[PDB]
Each structure stands twice: as structure tokens, then as C-alpha cells.
Amino acid sequence: QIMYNYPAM
Amino acid sequence: GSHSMRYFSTSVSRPGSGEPRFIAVGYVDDTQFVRFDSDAASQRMEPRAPWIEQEGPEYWDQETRNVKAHSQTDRENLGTLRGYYNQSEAGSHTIQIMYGCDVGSDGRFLRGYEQHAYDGKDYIALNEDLRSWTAADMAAQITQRKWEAARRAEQLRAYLEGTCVEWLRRYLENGKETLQRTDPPKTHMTHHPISDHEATLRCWALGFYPAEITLTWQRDGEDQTQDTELVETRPAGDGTFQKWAAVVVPSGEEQRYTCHVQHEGLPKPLTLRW
Amino acid sequence: IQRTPKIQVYSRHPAENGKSNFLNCYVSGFHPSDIEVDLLKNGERIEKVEHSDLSFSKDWSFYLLYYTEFTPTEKDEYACRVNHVTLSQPKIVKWDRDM
């Protein structure tokens, strides 16, 4: 299962 | 029998009117099980191993929803990094991410990972302690400070030690018939005269899983590395892997040169000669 | 920074004239990701060629497997053709049943 969100850089 | 889960994604900007191409894949050990391609017609996360198709619409709805959000975040991050680096809109640039977890044979957390690259070079990564970051340059330290203020390491550590481990356990059980198999290499030697004084020996390993393998040559009992060639381990296309190792030897002296094969599917390493 | 593809062309199973098999071109180590990969039969592109989903190695370089079903024969010559921004002309590697 993938992570919920990717981070803003 | 430790195991891993890894997710990979690549976002590539397409200068002009277009949106970026986003491709994500997931793997359990050396076996791919999901993909997403923003260019594809489905706009859904798709199965790529038989043992994941049993998950219900709720599994697929959430994966699709979150992978689309991931693509949109990377689209925004391509613009952010372009700004940090004072880059034009005219060029194509690439953001890559790898993340996931390792577990032991008891299914308990061993290690977690999250690494980011820009244009094929390190940008920022989570350290082994899952509590600190390594930034490659000052741009990446702008990102680092944002993630420090947001307590991202703690939130990401919860995913890597929690969700990632538990779902890896679920996949390993649902796919145990194939994921918890070891296929030992089938080995053979080939031989090619080159000249009145030289010959090539090539040691083959075929049909093995997982992909990790070691091929080494010994001349009269010590490791032989001069005049050797080792190809990258390569997929056979059926879920197994292949590798070969070659050495150039004086013609007629092939009996001196032994290939040694180490693989986790072998009770003991194999040795072979022409 | 750009990285030139590495190429291996090979069959799935040991080749036997007249027996069905798969022909593989594995190309790795390249950056950026846009690439052209084809399998050739007697110098002509094979139409029904599939490929794996883009992924990458620890050093961030990309890899892909391109593959097709084929039945090797005495008279048929196979090759893999790769084009990439790093290449001044397409690279053509001939299939050698012992490589």
C-alpha cells in the first residue's frame, strides 16, 4: 500500500 | 528469509502545453505487483502480479486516488525545483523517488527508506535512523527545513514501520506460493576457442529467483579477476533471472579455472568447469 | 547529466531451432528516460513487442525489458536496436545464442 501523500519540496 | 517492499516513481516534465509523465511501480522483493502510468487510458493503479488481483475495489480505489495525488504533488515539485535552480521552462527535468521497508523472516520491521533525486542526482534522503535527512545541496536544505518544521520524519516513519510492514506481510502471505519460493540457478559452461593461444570460458546461471547471485572465477584455487567479464543480472521475463561470467584463458589450460555460484536457493555453492 | 544505455539481447530459454521462445532486449543504466528500443528480425522491426514498466536502479539510472515471442531458426538473424539522446546513431546489438 502506497503512502498517503507525497511531500511538497 | 528477509523481504522488502519498494515503490518507485518517476515524473518527467514535458515542455510546452503538456503535463508531466508520471510512472509508478511497486515491488515485493524482485516481483513487480502494481503500476500506474499517467499516459495510460485507465488512469488507475493496475495489478501486475496475480496475487494482488484479489484485493477489492476499496484497495484499488485508495491506491488510485493516492497515486494520482502523488503525481500532482510531483507536478508542483517540478516547478518548485525549477525555481530553486533558476532553470528555464524550456527543458525536461525528472524527479525520482524510491521508498519502502524491509522485514525479517519473523515479519517484523528491519529498515525503512525514502530517497529523492532531481535530474538523476541525489537531492534529499531519509537517514537510516528515520529521524533525520541528508540534503545534497542548499536547494535540498530548503526542502529539508520545510520537512523539519512539518515533523515529516515522524509521519513518514509511522508509514514505513507501520503500513509498509503490515501490507508487505499481507502481500507475502497472499503470494506465498511464488514470493516465498527460491528457484536455484541451473548452471552450465560454454567454451569458445579464440586462437592458438586463447579460449573463452563462459559460466552460466539461469532460471533463478530471487535475483541476488554471486559468480566468481578461481584459477588454481584463488579468486581470478584479471581478464574476466561479468554481465549485469538480467530478467528472463518469466519471473526468473539470468547471469553469466566469462574469463579468457590459455587454450588447453581450462582445467585451472573453476566457476563458483552462490545463491540462496543452493544448499551449498556450486562449482563447475568446462 | 546524461547516461548512455547498456544493452543485452538474449533469449528466455536456451535457443532450439524450431522451438518457441522469447527474445529479450534489456537496456539499463540510461538517463534521461525517453528511449527507443526495438527487436529486429533480418533487419526489420518486429511489430508485437512488449516492454516492462519504467523503473530504476540505486544510482537512479533507468532500466527496461523489451520482449517478444519468437521461434529461432537457422536462417533468421535477430538484433536489438536502441536510440537515445546520448547516441550519435542507433546502437544495434546482434543476438548471439551464447551471450
Residue numbers in the entry:
A (entry chain C): 1 to 9
B (entry chain A): 1 to 274
C (entry chain B): 1 to 99
Can I see the authors' text?
In contrast, MTB could be presented by HLA-A*30:03. Here, our results indicate that MTB bind to HLA-A*30:03, but not to HLA-A*30:01. In addition to binding peptides through PΩ-Lys, as do other A3 supertype members such as HLA-A*30:01 and HLA-A*11:01, HLA-A*30:03 could also bind peptides with hydrophobic residues as PΩ anchors. The PΩ residues of MTB (Met) and NP44 (Tyr) could also form stable hydrogen bonds with the residues in the F pocket of HLA-A*30:03. We found that HLA-A*30:03 could present MTB-M9Y, MTB-M9F, MTB-M9I, MTB-M9V, and MTB-M9L peptides with A1 supertype binding motifs and could also present the MTB-M9K peptide with A3 supertype binding motifs. However, it could not present MTB-M9R. In contrast to the typical A3 supertype alleles, HLA-A*30:03 could not present MTB when the PΩ residue was mutated to an Arg. One possible reason for this is that Arg has a stronger positive charge than Lys, while Asn77 and Glu114 gives a weaker negative charge in the F pocket of HLA-A*30:03 than that of A3 supertype alleles. The positive charge of Arg was too strong for it to insert into the F pocket of HLA-A*30:03. The strength of the negative charge of the HLA-A*30:03 F pocket was between that of the A3 supertype and A1 supertype alleles. This allowed the F pocket of HLA-A*30:03 to accommodate both the basic amino acids preferred by the A3 supertype and the aromatic and large hydrophobic amino acids preferred by the A1 supertype.
